[PDB]
């Protein structure tokens, strides 16, 4: 495990209030949910 | 800013606060009627706040001026944050002094390894919510696009740059956006994004303003 | 409602077997979950 | 292909089937030792399948040849599918005939409004799973980057093109990838992505091969 690997280990947000976050992955908020 | 220090009252006179009823973003006074922020920071009925230190107490050097016009870059990509630049027009004309001073536009792009100053009123802990009322600052170099390219694969476009520590502990954070990244006394960046705050191998992403000086220059001159 | 608006109304996949899908959004498979 | 028609036995001789134990992608015979597919179609121990019509019954014109080498574009972005091109090297040398013929590389890029031919063994229903054993074809023009740009905002890069119907009913689908998009008798696209299959305002996205002829040419000549 690198960067605590993918599975929504790509929630690159903005530094605004509140931010806008986009997940990368492939197959306020976000982040953990999921993996496998 | 995480891992920063308190600048001091007007140590950063071009630093501007955007308030839509609460501070939500930073900005930069590039001249007296115009302010540069990030395009992702756009909202309606924005109030520009000049000569700010304690953003929760009226200290006396403040100039609160509402925008009359806001222009987002024509090729601003909300999905990739590419071209994250916005220009804000003050209703009035700010008074330029000791503590209220504009920033100089870049004429050449700073190279990797140049030390710059970052600052804002955004979050101080990579973890949790804990928002200073005071303006916090940070000094971090411009990293290689090569290493910016390795941190965030496939997201670094030609209009962005990473400044920071691959190590973490020091970085911009939520509420810092739109804020100045200055280096050698000319504005070179705009606090854009990152993947968390001061996380390892996750340095901050900024807007390469040097790519936008003509747009700015042009626009400021027609509106 | 346009394109049945966002909320994971951006699951642009590839046409491989099985595909690789990425959601856009901001805040085998994927697609619906969520909205608001 | 959705909304297509059955090509007919060897009506498309450059069409190749990639099998890793099951068909997973299409490809294109650009010459006799080399095949072009999409970079997102890379796997290990790939078998190229030439002179295919019924991919579930040995009909007699087939040439099954395993790859000795596979090369993904150096600037292939799995997050944006930008530069979705891969080159596959056959262990052998295929036999070029009636039904086994290579495709011509582009010398100029086809303009919006040019009719091309798309084909494959991918899915025929925008909805559900229902995989032909036969090779299905489709005729669709090259749309404006302007309208490709409106369909998929912020995702169309300079190395992609939309071909299809903003209307739907006709389109490429899952299992078509890596497959040829031919126009005026030269390969202009590679079945890349889209957002579903034959959905309205969601036309198919292809790889602008015209941007890669030097890379191909170069690479094919050194390996």
Describe what you observe in this structure.
The complex is a heterotetramer, with 2 copies of chain A (36 residues) and 2 copies of chain B (223 residues). With 36 residues, chain A is mostly beta strands. Chain A has one domain (1-36). Chain A contains no helices and 2 strands. Chain A has strands at 11-13, 21-23. Chain A has a two-stranded antiparallel ribbon with strand order 1-2. In chain A, a hairpin with a 7-residue loop joins strand 1 (11-13) and strand 2. The two termini of chain A are 13 Å apart. Chain B is mainly β and 223 residues long. Chain B folds into 2 domains: 1-12 and 103-210, Thrombin, subunit H (Beta Barrel), CATH 2.40.10.10; 13-102 and 211-223, Thrombin, subunit H (Beta Barrel). In chain B, strands 1-9-8-11-12-13-10 form a 7-stranded antiparallel β-sheet. The longest helix of chain B has 8 residues, at 213-220. The termini of chain B are far apart. Classes of the chains: A mainly beta (36), B mainly beta (223). The A-B interface holds A 3, 10-20, 22, 24 and B 22-25, 38, 40-41, 78-79, 81, 122, 152, 155, 172-178, 191-197, 201-202, 204. Chains B, D: It is an enzyme of class 3 (hydrolase). Chains B, D: Belongs to the peptidase S1 family. Chains B, D: Residues 1-221 form the Peptidase S1 domain. Chains B, D: Interacts with SERPINA1.
Name the descriptors.
heterotetramer; A: 36 residues; mainly beta; 2 strands; elongated; B: 223 residues; Thrombin, subunit H; 2 helices; 31% strand; Bowman-Birk type proteinase inhibitor (chains A, C); serine-type endopeptidase activity (chains B, D); calcium (chains B, D); Peptidase_S1_PA_chymotrypsin (chains B, D)
């Amino acid at each position: 495990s690198e960067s605590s690997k993918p599975c929504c280990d790509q929630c690159s947000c903005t530094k605004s209030m509140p931010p806008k976050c986009r997940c990368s992955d492939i197959r306020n908020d976000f982040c953990y949910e999921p993996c496998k | 800013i995480v891992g920063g220090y308190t600048c001091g009252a007007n140590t950063v006179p071009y630093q501007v606060s955007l308030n839509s009823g609460y501070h939500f973003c930073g900005g930069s006074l590039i001249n007296s009627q115009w302010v540069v922020s990030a395009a992702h920071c756009y909202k309606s009925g924005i109030q520009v706040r000049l000569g700010e230190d304690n953003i929760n107490v009226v200290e006396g050097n403040e100039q609160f001026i509402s925008a009359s016009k806001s222009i987002v870059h024509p090729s601003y990509n909300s999905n990739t944050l590419n071209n994250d630049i916005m220009l804000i027009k003050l209703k009035s004309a700010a008074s330029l002094n000791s503590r209220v001073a504009s920033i100089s536009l870049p004429t050449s792009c700073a190279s990797a390894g140049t030390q710059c100053l970052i600052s804002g009123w955004g979050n101080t802990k990579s973890s949790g919510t804990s928002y200073p009322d005071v303006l916090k600052c940070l000094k971090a170099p411009i990293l290689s696009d090569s290493s910016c390219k390795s941190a965030y694969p496939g997201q670094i476009t030609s209009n962005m740059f990473c400044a920071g520590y691959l190590e973490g502990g020091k970085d911009s954070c939520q509420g810092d956006s739109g804020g100045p990244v200055v280096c050698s006394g000319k504005l070179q960046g705009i606090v854009s994004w990152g993947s968390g705050c001061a996380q390892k191998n996750k340095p901050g992403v900024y807007t390469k303003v040097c790519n936008y000086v003509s747009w700015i220059k042009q626009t400021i001159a027609s509106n």
